[PDB]
Amino acid sequence: SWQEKINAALDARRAADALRRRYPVAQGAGRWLVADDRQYLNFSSNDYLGLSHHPQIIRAWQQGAEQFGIGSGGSGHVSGYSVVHQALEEELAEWLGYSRALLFISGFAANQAVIAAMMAKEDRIAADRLSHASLLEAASLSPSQLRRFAHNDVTHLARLLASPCPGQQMVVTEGVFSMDGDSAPLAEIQQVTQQHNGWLMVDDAHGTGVIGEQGRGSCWLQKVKPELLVVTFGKGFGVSGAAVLCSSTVADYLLQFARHLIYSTSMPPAQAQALRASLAVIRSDEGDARREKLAALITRFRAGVQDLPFTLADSCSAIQPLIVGDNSRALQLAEKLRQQGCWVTAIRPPTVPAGTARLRLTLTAAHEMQDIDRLLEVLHGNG
Amino acid sequence: SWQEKINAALDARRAADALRRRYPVAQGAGRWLVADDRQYLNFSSNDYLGLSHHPQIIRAWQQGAEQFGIGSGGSGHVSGYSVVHQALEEELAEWLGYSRALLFISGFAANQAVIAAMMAKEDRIAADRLSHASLLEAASLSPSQLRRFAHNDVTHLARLLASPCPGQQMVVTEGVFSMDGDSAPLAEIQQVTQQHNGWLMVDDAHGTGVIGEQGRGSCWLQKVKPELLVVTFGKGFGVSGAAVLCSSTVADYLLQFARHLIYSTSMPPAQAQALRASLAVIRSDEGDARREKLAALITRFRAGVQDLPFTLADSCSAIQPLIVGDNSRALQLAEKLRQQGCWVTAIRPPTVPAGTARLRLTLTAAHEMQDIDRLLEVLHGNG
Ligand SMILES: *C(F)(F)C/N=C/c1c(COP(=O)(O)O)cnc(C)c1O
Ligand SMILES: *C(F)(F)C/N=C/c1c(COP(=O)(O)O)cnc(C)c1O
Incomplete structure (x- = not known):
């Protein structure tokens, strides 16, 4: 029964194994x-x-609420696309040197929407063995083929990419890694990915805001522009939410096909003002x-x-x-x-x-x- | 190439077909x-x-920020579980008559975490043909078997459930439907689902707050308690975010296995105060x-x-x-x-x-x- 399945997935946990309480x-x-x-x-x-x-971030969150109320009302594709969302998008893209940015309610949501909209069953995802649960979870659900390369091992990545593939290859890695705080070798990674006609996706949750001129993060520090940059704002920005940074055509593609973007409630405009204030302090x-x-x-x-x-x-x-x-x-x-x-x-x-x-x-x-x-x-x- | 794939998924759109701009x-x-x-x-x-x-909702959002700052700092399983998150959870569960509630950053995230943690390849999801993109998207990515029953057709649902299944059956429907604003026949649906030893998941995004004694929504109005109730707060609550309502053992199960819950940044505590204020007005x-x-x-x-x-x-x-x-x-x-x-x-x-x-x-x-x-x-x- 369902309860037996739940009671047994629970009951069969080891102690100093993986049981977890919230304080x-x-x-x-x-x-x-x-x-x-x-x-x-x-x-x-x-x-x-x-x-x-x-x-200043607190103040922007407070005054935002006075100006726009709290909830946006709905989707970005309906009446939930506020002038503040659009200014934040534009300010992110300019900061990080991309053509477009699209806002998301969280990094998980952003990583999921990209992978979901972009990867097909014929496609392959080559992800670093230590990539964050959000990247991997999505990559693993994807119909595409997931292959995990050894942490930061650009020789292994190369082999993975050189294998015959019936579609396209997306490489995924982090700017600063979650676990250990180490950086990926982005310049070399990009280099083999271009060699194999792949595109590169970097999740810079842990570097964004915190390193680089004006805090632009791991890619900018390393002089690499991947095709997809995901930044999230619950870490060094001190708020919550995320953006995907990308080209005109891919942002247009994501607006047409990314269901998580099409049908989800946009963030409160006041949260978006607080994000613009945080970006200002960061720059x-x-x-x-x-x-x-x-x-x-x-x-x-x-x-x-x-x-x-x-x-x-x-x-x-x-x-x-x-x-x-x-x-x-x-x-x-x-x-x-x-x-x-x-x-x-x-x-x-x-x-x-x-x-x-x-x-x-x-x-x-x-x-x-x-x-x-x-x-x-x-x-x-x-x- | 990738660009050819993007340019061609775009180029091959019909006009009065499905092209979409944001205002x-x-x-x-x-x-x-x-x-x-x-x-x-x-x-x-x-x-x-x-x-x-x-x-009052605006005021709670503003004073929350003064009390707790903005970002929570991290995950609920680390230092991002605030006393305010826990009071809101407790207040939701008591309101809707469940044992537990777990907070999520959005409905998409909540629907995804549940389905992902709960459904295995052996399992079956029986979902109403008109279920929201978030339910279906997740159900379709799931390794489990998706079968869509005709909108509100409890006879069809019955057939779907009676088919031999190697695991467990989750039934999914909405309290108030997105498209047309009609209600599902929850009492009858629950009835065939219990008949076939399934469990029921209701997404009441469109009813929550807005019908029922104290606004408790579609299930409470219809005298049905499904095993999973998902409520989201960007509609009638006038904010953003979501909760899953469920039993002690399933909430414990979700805390152990639901990666989207384990590794995502919790919502700003000020957003959670604004949600408690909104629930208070609603009740x-x-x-x-x-x-x-x-x-x-x-x-x-x-x-x-x-x-x-x-x-x-x-x-x-x-x-x-x-x-x-x-x-x-x-x-x-x-x-x-x-x-x-x-x-x-x-x-x-x-x-x-x-x-x-x-x-x-x-x-x-x-x-x-x-x-x-x-x-x-x-x-x-x-x-
Ligand atoms: C942070 F460490 F608390 C949670 N890790 C989150 C994360 C994401 C997820 O975005 P979120 O906004 O929290 O839902 C994406 N990439 C990375 C590397 C991390 O750590
Ligand atoms: C609303 F109509 F703007 C978007 N529809 C969202 C929805 C969800 C998603 O939760 P969200 O919090 O917006 O990401 C889940 N269930 C339903 C029925 C709807 O409409």
């Missing part, structure tokens, strides 16, 4: 975390530039200050761990995995950090290679040097 | 529509209760007033069309399709309404049966009797 917080974004009325240094949010509490001198500060905090932390019995991943992004190895080790560590007021989150098997239990630490430009030193002090004292 | 508006939700600086009576938004501009005496007014406006309009050479669909929801038949007819009509300050949207083949060119009119409780009379006056004068 409610009063504040979850930026420097601090408030949980059951206790304040903690937050090293687990994705607010990399501390923009979630920026007063400004204040933008450069925040990115410089986050970089100095990363330097301070990486320097401080040299002395510690932990291993760091190859990241110079806000994402800093701290390899502990033994899961009882990690668990005990994480609970110790928490007891000392540093809120961190422990990642253990099966999520990652047995003996890779890591803390997935995040830093933001809202943090201060003395926070990093506290984290370091705490990592020293117990371990 | 930017200054205001798209509720009584009025502002476009290129002209005001129009808006008969094309999904703001059925006029709540998009309600001052209140003001709630009943708005629903009574929308009902009186529907009565006035349906009564006024009896005299006119158009045909109405079987709706007593805010959705009122006005059948015109001849597409040149519909087009000319719609452009005439617009020239007379009533913003309506014309739906023609191939979207609907040749000779079914209709205006898809919507009314809301923000409208007044004199708006309906203007629309009627305009429908009379030219036709």
